[PDB]
Amino acid sequence: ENGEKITSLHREVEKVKLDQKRLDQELDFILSQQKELEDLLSPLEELVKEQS
Amino acid sequence: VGTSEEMKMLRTESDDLHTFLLEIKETTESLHGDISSLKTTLLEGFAGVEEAREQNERNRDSGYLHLLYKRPLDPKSEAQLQEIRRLHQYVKFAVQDVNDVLDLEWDQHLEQKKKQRHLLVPERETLFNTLANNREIINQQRKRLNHLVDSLQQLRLYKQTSLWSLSSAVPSQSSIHSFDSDLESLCNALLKTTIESHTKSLPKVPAKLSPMKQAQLRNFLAKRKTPPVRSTAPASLSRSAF
Amino acid sequence: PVGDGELWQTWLPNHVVFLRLREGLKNQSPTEAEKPASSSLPSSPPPQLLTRNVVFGLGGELFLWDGEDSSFLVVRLRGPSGGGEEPALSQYQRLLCINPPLFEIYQVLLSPTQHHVALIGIKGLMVLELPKRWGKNSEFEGGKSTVNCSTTPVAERFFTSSTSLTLKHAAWYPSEILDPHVVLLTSDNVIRIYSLREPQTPTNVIILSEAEEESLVLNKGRAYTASLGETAVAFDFGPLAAVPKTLFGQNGKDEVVAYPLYILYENGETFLTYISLLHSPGNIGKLLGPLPMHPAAEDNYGYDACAVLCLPCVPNILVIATESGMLYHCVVLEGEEEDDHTSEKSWDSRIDLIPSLYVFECVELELALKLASGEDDPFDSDFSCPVKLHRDPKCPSRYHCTHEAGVHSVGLTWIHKLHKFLGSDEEDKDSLQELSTEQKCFVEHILCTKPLPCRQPAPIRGFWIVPDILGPTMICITSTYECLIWPLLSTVHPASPPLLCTREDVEVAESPLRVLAETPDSFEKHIRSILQRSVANPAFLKASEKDIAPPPEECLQLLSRATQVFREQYILKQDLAKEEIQRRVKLLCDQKKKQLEDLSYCREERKSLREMAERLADKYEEAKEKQEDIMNRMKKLLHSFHSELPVLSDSERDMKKELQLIPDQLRHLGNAIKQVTMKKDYQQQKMEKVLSLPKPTIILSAYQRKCIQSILKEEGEHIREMVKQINDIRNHVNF
Amino acid sequence: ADASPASAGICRIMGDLMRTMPILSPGNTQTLTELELKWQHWHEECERYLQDSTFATSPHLESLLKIMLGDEAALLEQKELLSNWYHFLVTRLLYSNPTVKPIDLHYYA
Given a contact cutoff of 8 angstroms between Cβ atoms, the answer to whether C316 and C330 are in contact is no
Q: Exposure string (b/e) for C219-252, b if CB count within 10 Å is 16 or more?
A: eeeeeeeeeebbbbbbbbbbbbbebbeeeeeeee
Cross-chain Cβ contact B189/D27 below 8 Å:
yes
Rg of chain C over Cα atoms, rounded to whole angstroms, equals: 44
Residue C678 CB: number of other CB atoms within 10 A?
A: 10
Q: Roughly what angle, to the nearest 10 degrees, separates helices C662-688 and B77-115?
A: 20
Given a contact cutoff of 8 angstroms between Cβ atoms, the answer to whether C489 and C482 are in contact is no
Given a contact cutoff of 8 angstroms between Cβ atoms, the answer to whether C503 and C538 are in contact is no
**Residue B120, helix vs strand vs coil:** coil
Given a contact cutoff of 8 angstroms between Cβ atoms, the answer to whether C320 and C305 are in contact is yes
Chain D hits for C81, CB-CB cut-off 8 Å, are 97, 104, 107
Q: How far apart are CA B175 and CA C648, in angstroms?
A: 88
Chain C hits for D47, CB-CB cut-off 8 Å, are 1
Helix ranges restricted to H, D7-71: 8-20, 32-51, 59-68
* Greatest C-alpha distance within chain A: 76
Of B31, B38, B49, the CB nearest to A40: B49
Q: List C-alpha distances in Å: B73 to B78, C444, C493, C631.
A: 5, 107, 94, 22
Q: What is the resolution of this structure in A?
A: 12.0
Q: Which of C58, C73, C60 is nearest to C114 (CA)?
A: C58
Cross-chain Cβ contact B21/A16 below 8 Å:
yes
Given a contact cutoff of 8 angstroms between Cβ atoms, the answer to whether D100 and D91 are in contact is no
DSSP assignment of C53-94 equals B-EEEETTEEEEEETTTTEEEEEE----SSSSPPP-TT--EE
Give, for C531, the enclosing helix (H) or strand (E): none
DSSP assignment of B148-204 equals HHHHHHHTTS-----------------SS--HHHHHHHHHHHHHTT--------PPP
Q: How far apart are CA C10 and CA C175, in angstroms?
A: 38
Q: How far apart are CA C265 and CA C271, in angstroms?
A: 8
User: At residue C267, what is the residue type?
Assistant: N
DSSP assignment of C373-420 equals --TT-TT--------EEEE-TT-TTEEEEEETTEEEEEE-TTHHHHHH
Given a contact cutoff of 8 angstroms between Cβ atoms, the answer to whether B234 and C564 are in contact is yes
Q: How far apart are CA D77 and CA C575, in angstroms?
A: 42
Q: How far apart are CA C494 and CA C491, in angstroms?
A: 9
- What are the DSSP E strand ranges found in C297-396? 305-311, 317-322, 326-333, 356-364, 388-391
Q: How far apart are CA B70 and CA C706, in angstroms?
A: 77
Q: How far apart are CA C292 and CA C353, in angstroms?
A: 12
Pairing of the two strands C442-448 and C539-540 = parallel
Give, for B39, the enclosing helix (H) or strand (E): helix B6-58
Is C80 an interface residue toward D (CB < 8 Å)? Answer: yes
The alpha carbon of residue D41 is apart from the nearest alpha carbon of chain C, in Å, by: 11
Asked whether the CA dihedral C571, C574, C580, C583 is positive or negative, the reply is negative
Given a contact cutoff of 8 angstroms between Cβ atoms, the answer to whether C348 and C271 are in contact is no
Cross-chain Cβ contact A45/C602 below 8 Å:
no
Backbone angles phi and psi of C271, in degrees to 5: -125, 160
Given a contact cutoff of 8 angstroms between Cβ atoms, the answer to whether C599 and B14 are in contact is yes
Cross-chain Cβ contact C239/B42 below 8 Å:
no
Pairing of the two strands C133-134 and C139-140 = antiparallel
Q: List C-alpha distances in Å: D4 to C672, C714, D12, D50.
A: 54, 22, 12, 22
- Which among B26, B49, B59 is the top mutation candidate for probing chain A, defined by the most A β-carbons within 10 Å of its own β-carbon? B49
Q: How far apart are CA C364 and CA C358, in angstroms?
A: 18
Given a contact cutoff of 8 angstroms between Cβ atoms, the answer to whether C380 and C410 are in contact is no
Q: Which of C98, C95, C109, C110 is nearest to C140 (CA)?
A: C95
Residue of B nearest to A44 (CA): B53
Cross-chain Cβ contact A30/B49 below 8 Å:
no
Q: Which of C139, C135, C136, C115 is nearest to C127 (CA)?
A: C115
- Using a threshold of 3 CB pairs under 8 A, tell whether chains C and B touch: yes
First to last CA, chain C: 54
Chain A residues within 8 Å of chain B (Cβ atoms): 1-2, 5-6, 9, 12-13, 15-16, 19-20, 23, 26-27, 30, 33-34, 37, 40-41, 44, 47
Cross-chain Cβ contact D103/C80 below 8 Å:
no
Chain C hits for A7, CB-CB cut-off 8 Å, are 509-510, 598
Q: How far apart are CA C555 and CA C385, in angstroms?
A: 25
**Residue C204, helix vs strand vs coil:** strand
Q: How far apart are CA B19 and CA A9, in angstroms?
A: 10
Is D26 an interface residue toward B (CB < 8 Å)? Answer: yes
Helix ranges restricted to H, C216-270: 222-227
Q: How far apart are CA C108 and CA C70, in angstroms?
A: 13
Residue of B nearest to C614 (CA): B27
Q: How far apart are CA C397 and CA C329, in angstroms?
A: 12
Q: List C-alpha distances in Å: C550 to B108, C150, C455.
A: 111, 49, 8
Cross-chain Cβ contact D97/C81 below 8 Å:
yes
Chain B hits for C360, CB-CB cut-off 8 Å, are 221, 224, 226
Cross-chain Cβ contact B39/A30 below 8 Å:
yes
Chain B hits for C725, CB-CB cut-off 8 Å, are 145, 149, 163
The alpha carbon of residue C478 is apart from the nearest alpha carbon of chain D, in Å, by: 36
Chains within contact range of chain B (3+ C-beta pairs < 8 Å):
A, C, D
At residue D103's C-alpha, the angle toward residues D100 and D106, to 5°, is 85
At residue D8's C-alpha, the angle toward residues D4 and D11, to 5°, is 125
Cross-chain Cβ contact B189/D26 below 8 Å:
yes
Backbone angles phi and psi of D50, in degrees to 5: -75, -45
Asked whether the CA dihedral C168, C174, C178, C180 is positive or negative, the reply is positive
User: At residue A35, what is the residue type?
Assistant: K
Query: Which positions ≥6 away from C643 have C-beta within 8 Å?
Result: none
Backbone angles phi and psi of C363, in degrees to 5: -110, 140
